[PDB]
Structure 1
Amino acid sequence: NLTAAESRIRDVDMAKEMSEFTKNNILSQASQAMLAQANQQPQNVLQLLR
């Protein structure tokens, strides 16, 4: 019962944490794509206002 109690403290919902892991990968990658786009827009500006 005591190791179970500990296990509740250290309970990893491994499915949750893999899922959340997945999500955070997705979110990182998406945000970086948008950072690229943030660097693309002012180049378009550069040409258009040259």
Structure 2
Amino acid sequence: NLTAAESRIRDVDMAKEMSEFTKNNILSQASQAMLAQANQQPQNVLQLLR
């Protein structure tokens, strides 16, 4: 019972923590896409310059 309790504290629902892992990766890479699109506006400003 105490090894069970310790486990419920210390251990990980590694299935759930993997779904979370995936999720955080997708959020990172999505933010990276938003960065890629974000760095495209000043060039349009340059098109306006010439």
Bucket of the pairwise TM-score, normalised by the shorter protein: 0.7 to 0.9
Distance 2:34 2:20 in 1: 21
TM-score (norm 2): 0.85
The number of residues matched between the two structures is 50
SS at match of 1:7: helix
1:49 to partner: Cα distance: 3.0
1:12 to partner: Cα distance: 0.8
Between 1:2-11 and 1:22-31, the stretch displaced more is 2-11
RMSD (Å) for aligned C-alpha atoms: 1.1
Deviating beyond 2 angstroms after TM superposition, the runs of 4 or more aligned structure 1 residues are none
TM-score (norm 1): 0.85
1:48 to partner: Cα distance: 2.3
